[PDB]
Design a protein around this ligand. Structure first.
Ligand SMILES: CSc1scc2c1-c1nc(SCC(=O)C(C)(C)C)ncc1CC2
Length: 148
């Protein structure tokens, strides 16, 4: 039903149609959800199962995602520390969600921007591009290899 592309054993990437698959989320022991949109609903919120973080962003040329980098990392860390998986998603392009996942890999695995990009690409091949987001990731790499 839902490709919940597993980036790491505790970190899953998907689109809106993927976040609407409760069985899959429970099969994979997901307890945390990051919704990187403004307008989509927090699926299954009324069910009392998951914890959530909305990152209110749009697939745009002007959207800043680096602001939400530290937030998303602290949630990823709570899910792992608490031994449960996290699904970060947005919509069809997974452009917004994939930017954040990559950002995580570059900081917490210390990959390069491109090395993480080859890593994510290989697992989920279809990923709408966004040159605005790529620039922020490169800005992030500079800042990680500098200590800032
Ligand atoms: C960190 S992405 C990266 S790094 C080096 C290259 C690329 C790339 N990416 C994409 S789509 C993925 C995206 O744009 C994001 C939503 C994750 C920002 N198409 C083509 C290329 C060519 C070469």
């Amino acid at each position: 039903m839902a490709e919940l592309t597993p980036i790491l054993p505790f970190l899953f990437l998907g689109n809106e149609q993927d976040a609407q698959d409760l069985d899959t989320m429970q099969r994979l022991n997901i307890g945390y959800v990051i919704n990187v949109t403004t307008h989509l609903p927090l699926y299954h919120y009324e069910k009392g199962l998951f914890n959530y973080k909305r990152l209110p962003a749009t697939d745009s040329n002007k959207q800043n995602l680096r602001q939400y980098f530290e937030e998303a990392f602290e949630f990823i860390e709570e899910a792992h520390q608490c031994g449960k998986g996290l699904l970060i998603h947005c919509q069809a392009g997974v452009s917004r969600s994939a930017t954040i996942v990559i950002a995580y890999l570059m900081k917490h695995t210390r990959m390069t921007m491109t090395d993480a990009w080859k890593f994510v690409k290989g697992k989920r091949p279809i990923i709408s591009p966004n040159l605005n987001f790529m620039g922020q990731l490169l800005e992030f790499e500079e800042d990680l290899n500098n200590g800032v």
